[PDB]
Amino acid sequence: ETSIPEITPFNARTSSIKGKRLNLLVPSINQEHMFGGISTALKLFEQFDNAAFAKRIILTDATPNPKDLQSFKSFKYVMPEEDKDFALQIVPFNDRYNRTIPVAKHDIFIATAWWTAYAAQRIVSWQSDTYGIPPNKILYIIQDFEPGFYQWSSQYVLAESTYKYRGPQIAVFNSELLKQYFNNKGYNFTDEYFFQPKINTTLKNYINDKRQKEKIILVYGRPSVKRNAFTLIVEALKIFVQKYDRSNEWKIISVGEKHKDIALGKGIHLNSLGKLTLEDYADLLKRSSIGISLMISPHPSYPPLEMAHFGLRVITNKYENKDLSNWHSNIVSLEQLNPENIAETLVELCMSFNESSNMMFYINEFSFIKEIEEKL
Amino acid sequence: FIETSIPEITPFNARTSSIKGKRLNLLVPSINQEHMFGGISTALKLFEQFDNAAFAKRIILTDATPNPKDLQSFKSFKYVMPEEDKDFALQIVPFNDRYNRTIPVAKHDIFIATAWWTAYAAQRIVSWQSDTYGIPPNKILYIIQDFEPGFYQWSSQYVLAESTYKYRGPQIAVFNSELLKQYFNNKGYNFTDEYFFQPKINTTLKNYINDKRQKEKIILVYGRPSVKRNAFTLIVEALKIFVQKYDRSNEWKIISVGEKHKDIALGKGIHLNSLGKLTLEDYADLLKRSSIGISLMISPHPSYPPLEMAHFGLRVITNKYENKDLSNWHSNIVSLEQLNPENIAETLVELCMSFNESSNMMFYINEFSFIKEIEEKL
Ligand SMILES: Cc1cn([C@H]2C[C@H](O)[C@@H](COP(=O)(O)OP(=O)(O)O)O2)c(=O)[nH]c1=O
Ligand SMILES: Cc1cn([C@H]2C[C@H](O)[C@@H](COP(=O)(O)OP(=O)(O)O)O2)c(=O)[nH]c1=O
């Protein structure tokens, strides 16, 4: 590897557009790639007064399948080579070599992935020089401490460097926890906003149903997403099955991402349900009594919160300032994170099978948007 | 296929031994000259410092079995299989192929860990040791070479690696450098005792540090594609920019040392030429002739090349990492706060133009004094 793909040059060119225009930089809008980060961004982006700003979504990594584009029927799919002043448009800019995208004097950028912010910051430099204007504010939607997605390496420092950008930048953090993490690490931004976690609307509709608890250990398993420590969980499970004589009594189920069923010993298996429908998921939550869900990151994830609010005792990990055991009584946070300690806690909870919340906000968002709009 | 287990933590099965005396056990992944990088060689150096007359010594290979050639560097050691239980004063035991096998552990076997996963094993052995022999847990000696969780993205390996620092049992930490030690302290890690050894100039190199240097226009790059911590690709990117945004670039030769790689085009017909790992002598020579150096270590711990370059009169471009800021160690070192290709390329231009002193790291040019003190705690 000679180059660094994430930072392939983002070539801009002059545009005649005189009005303001919000530009959302996202890697993809494909339903396949449609994970929580981009969907949250899109949700947030939707909040901007469409009458005060033109909106352009710029795809940086993946071109849409015609099916994917049906979720954006009000948007005009325009090639990077065109310069139309549509009020709503999408431009594919992943195949980007020797091509350019039009950037107006008052084009304002909203970054998501660290590398979209890397590009944005370089665009604001070019913008400022070509138009002879003060650098425009960048809107940075920070979903995680993304350098953590990489081992110490080129990508790590480049990802981080986007936080060290000295230009005008407004940070919008996913959760207050994340915001605080950044503050402790000493990062500075022109302005800091954050949006708190909020229960999925469909799920809330079930949160009051009568629950007939069974002996089910529900695992949030995603082999693909290292942050979720799938293998660590599997290891702890293997120990649990061995060091607990009443293990045979329990069903262990994996949800989140489809995977092969995994033998834990004694004929017991971790059975994968994959990504259940919100309804099925809600049902399973009501019947389940113990939950394991890990997120190696300062930012809170949803599953530990959902499980807890459905009456599960949830085993989860602490990460620096993140300690969910203070959010809800049902959550237990392990300080020493190894298979042995998980397996042990798992035994204690099973034996416990034979309340209090400090995160009221979770069950009733982008109020700041309006305020942010007045700074651009 | 999906990775189900975590290989680094394959069980480390022990069994009773009759050995009554004390015995220091060095857990290292490999002693092969191929795998013989600075971490294990430093450990071995440190391990050598222990009064061989007060302790029996056993090196336990955890990841790789030795080639007969590799074993010639340990001619005084008896290569013994894990199945034997001999009370030799010096021995090596291959314990990488470890499934359904066990290694003998004496009541007074004391362990010295290196890689995070060797410490992971050690800590689990001390538990078994304590239960089987009905004794208080023995101190573990942890030679911490880096914040090894950093070798991994957020993941299972990351937390397991870190968990070895959260071990609540008796553990003595011996850090590579004071910088690293401080990093751990800031992150809040606790150990029974904390020691550290500072960086010290390679002895062979010191022999050249006084030679007269005829500086040429050479930009010396510490390039190791294999070692991500060294940000090879980041350096190559900055180089490409430099060649483009500097009109006097054609005047400079850009050379890569450290690890052999394909020669890399930077534009304008200019190439980053790899010399690989030069002999200490050749390296020393090149250092004398070279005037600008780029060497990056994404880690709180100091690396050697930036220090070596600086002490040979090179202006060195290097990265800052949290508490590590080498620009305070030596006047020749420049530490970038904002680490991207543009900023490196720019600094690289400024230095070239500068081509047309002060040291606060005296210790670097005149080690394991603590060993004796540590010996008295085991
Ligand atoms: C586990 C699970 C979650 N969900 C929903 C509710 C959760 O809040 C949300 C979490 O998964 P997701 O948002 O896909 O994670 P990420 O954003 O990191 O890709 O998805 C389901 O619809 N079905 C399921 O089976
Ligand atoms: C670049 C280079 C370094 N060295 C020496 C000087 C340094 O003190 C030392 C550091 O490189 P090395 O030991 O390969 O790095 P690590 O310790 O991370 O494996 O190697 C050489 O002997 N020859 C060379 O060509």
Numbering used by the authors:
A (entry chain A): 28 to 381, 389 to 398, 402 to 413
B (entry chain B): 26 to 381, 389 to 398, 402 to 413
What does the paper say about this structure?
WsaF is the first rhamnosyltransferase to be structurally and biochemically characterised. WsaE is a multifunctional enzyme forming both an α-1,2- and the α-1,3-linkage; WsaF is a β-1,2-rhamnosyltransferase. Both enzymes utilise dTDP-β-l-rhamnose (dTDP-β-l-Rha) as the donor molecule. In the CAZy database, WsaF is annotated to GT4 family, which is the largest retaining GT-B fold family with currently 11,446 entries.
The structures of the dTDP-WsaFSER2 and dTDP-β-l-Rha-WsaFSER2 complexes were obtained by soaking and solved by molecular replacement using SeMet-WsaF as model. The majority of residues that interact with dTDP are located in the C-terminal domain, with the thymidine moiety forming polar interactions with the side chain of K302 and the main-chain atoms of L303 (with O2, N3, and O4 of thymidine). Upon binding of dTDP (or dTDP-β-l-Rha), the side chain of K302 becomes ordered and the amine forms a hydrogen bond with O2 of thymidine. Y308 π stacks (distance 3.9–4.2 Å) with the pyrimidine ring of the dTDP, a common feature in nucleotide binding proteins. E333 hydrogen bonds with the O3 of the 2-deoxyribose. In the dTDP complex, both phosphates make salt links (3.4 Å) with R249, the α-phosphate makes a salt link with K302 (4 Å), and the β-phosphate makes a salt link with R254 (4.2 Å), which has a slightly different conformation as compared to the other structures. Overall, the loop between P325 and P329 changes the conformation slightly upon binding of dTDP. The side chain of H326 turns into the catalytic site. The side chain of N201 shifts in the dTDP complex structure following H326. The dTDP shows interactions with R249, K302, and Y247, all of which are shown by mutagenesis to be important or critical for enzyme function.
